[PDB]
Amino acid sequence: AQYEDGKQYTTLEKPVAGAPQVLEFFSFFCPHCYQFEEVLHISDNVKKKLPEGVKMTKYHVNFMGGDLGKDLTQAWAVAMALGVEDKVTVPLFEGVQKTQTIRSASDIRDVFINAGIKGEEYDAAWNSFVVKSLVAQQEKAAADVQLRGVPAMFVNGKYQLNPQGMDTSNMDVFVQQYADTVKYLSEK
Amino acid sequence: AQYEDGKQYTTLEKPVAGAPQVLEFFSFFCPHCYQFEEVLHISDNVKKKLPEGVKMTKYHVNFMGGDLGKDLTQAWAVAMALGVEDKVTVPLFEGVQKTQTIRSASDIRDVFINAGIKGEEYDAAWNSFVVKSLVAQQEKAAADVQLRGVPAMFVNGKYQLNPQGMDTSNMDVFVQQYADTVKYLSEK
Numbered sequence: 468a469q470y471e472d473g474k475q476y477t478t479l480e481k482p483v484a485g486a487p488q489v490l491e492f493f494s495f496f497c498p499h500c501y502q503f504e505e506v507l508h509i510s511d512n513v514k515k516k517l518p519e520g521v522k523m524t525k526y527h528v529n530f531m532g533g534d535l536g537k538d539l540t541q542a543w544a545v546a547m548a549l550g551v552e553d554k555v556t557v558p559l560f561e562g563v564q565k566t567q568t569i570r571s572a573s574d575i576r577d578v579f580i581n582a583g584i585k586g587e588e589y590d591a592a593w594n595s596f597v598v599k600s601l602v603a604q605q606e607k608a609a610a611d612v613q614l615r616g617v618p619a620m621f622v623n624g625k626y627q628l629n630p631q632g633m634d635t636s637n638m639d640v641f642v643q644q645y646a647d648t649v650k651y652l653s654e655k
Numbered sequence: 656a657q658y659e660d661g662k663q664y665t666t667l668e669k670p671v672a673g674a675p676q677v678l679e680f681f682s683f684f685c686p687h688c689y690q691f692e693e694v695l696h697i698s699d700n701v702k703k704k705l706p707e708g709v710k711m712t713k714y715h716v717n718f719m720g721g722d723l724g725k726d727l728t729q730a731w732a733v734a735m736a737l738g739v740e741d742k743v744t745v746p747l748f749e750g751v752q753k754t755q756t757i758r759s760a761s762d763i764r765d766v767f768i769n770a771g772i773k774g775e776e777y778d779a780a781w782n783s784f785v786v787k788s789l790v791a792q793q794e795k796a797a798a799d800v801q802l803r804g805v806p807a808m809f810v811n812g813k814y815q816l817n818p819q820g821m822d823t824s825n826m827d828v829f830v831q832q833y834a835d836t837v838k839y840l841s842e843k
């Protein structure tokens with residue numbers, strides 16, 4: 468059979484209900500995450516091939532980057548709440564990993580202000596119930612799958628993508644194999 | 656006191672005779688090691704604060720990454736023998752952890768070739784007894800400090816850095832304390 472358990476994906480021993488259809492975890496400190504999102508365009512592709520009515524969810528994790536990692540999880544909650552994911556993702560990756568100009572919560576705030584968000588509005592969002600709830604949601608989701616590393620992607624809280632088990636030579640084929648695996652799993 | 660045994664550092668029960676003054680262990684498979692290099696630049700910041708006449712030594716370890724881990728220790732021995740550590744450290748870290756394009760000994764070699772090390776020069780070093788000795792040297796040093804994990808740093812075969820006991824509330828404050836602790840220990 469084309470798709471084999473342990474090859475393109477693994478099956479969670481204890482799946483959790485109410486899980487997002489397609490859930491991606493990442494960290495702005497995570498170099499392979501940077502590669503997935505900005506070089507291979509994994510999420511772009513996944514989305515291209517997702518069936519109708521299937522949405523992609525992406526959460527940040529706390530466990531990379533020391534305490535700043537936690538601030539980045541809250542900043543990502545702000546990005547989701549304000550709908551600016553597609554404006555701040557590059558300056559956050561670049562600021563953490565490339566130029567190393569993001570070292571403190573204030574440096575994160577500066578990225579949002581530089582992208583056109585008013586400081587007063589960033590601060591209001593930062594302290595909002597929506598963002599507090601989103602932070603807890605991101606942390607619970609990681610706990611629910613006993614998440615130990617990123618990048619990671621889960622389908623319906625039942626299956627975990629296993630890129631290590633895919634074609635690791637031809638990246639164009641790899642990227643579509645990853646996307647096709649998500650599509651196939653979503654149809655299960 | 657400001658510096659305390661059990662705080663910023665610990666004391667080896669069995670001090671190592673003839674150890675390097677400042678000895679750092681890492682693996683190209685080690686995610687925290689990637690951060691120590693690329694994001695914190697721990698070695699460089701330790702170096703710029705060390706007294707005159709104190710040299711720094713950095714060894715690779717086998718215990719991460721199985722077969723390729725051992726290949727990387729041998730390649731690091733080649734890097735040391737040829738004096739090209741600064742040319743290959745970033746592309747080896749990125750090849751293993753960011754792009755995941757390093758999967759074999761040949762892929763490791765490609766990094767050196769792309770960095771300008773000639774093919775015959777690399778191969779002659781790889782197969783040399785000088786390099787065999789450097790591999791054994793790295794392994795023996797790890798055994799002698801009873802190494803359990805990386806990153807790790809040891810001063811004068813007597814003291815082990817304990818980043819857990821440092822000010823980790825800011826990554827730059829942390830790097831500063833780490834480097835200042837090494838300086839303190841080197842003067843001790």
Ligand SMILES: Cc1nc(-c2ccc(C(F)(F)F)cc2)sc1C(=O)O
Nearest residue numbers: 532533687690691694695805806826
């Ligand atoms: C547990 C641990 N955690 C470390 C760490 C945390 C954060 C960062 C950075 F913020 F720079 F990304 C680097 C290393 S090193 C380390 C160890 O095993 O000594």
Ligand SMILES: Cc1nc(-c2ccc(C(F)(F)F)cc2)sc1C(=O)O
Nearest residue numbers: 532533534818819823824825826829
């Ligand atoms: C050994 C260690 N090392 C840690 C660490 C090092 C650096 C940083 C930062 F750079 F982010 F400030 C955070 C935590 S936590 C930790 C532990 O296991 O207790």
Ligand SMILES: [Cu+2]
Nearest residue numbers: 468469470471
């Ligand atoms: Cu089959």
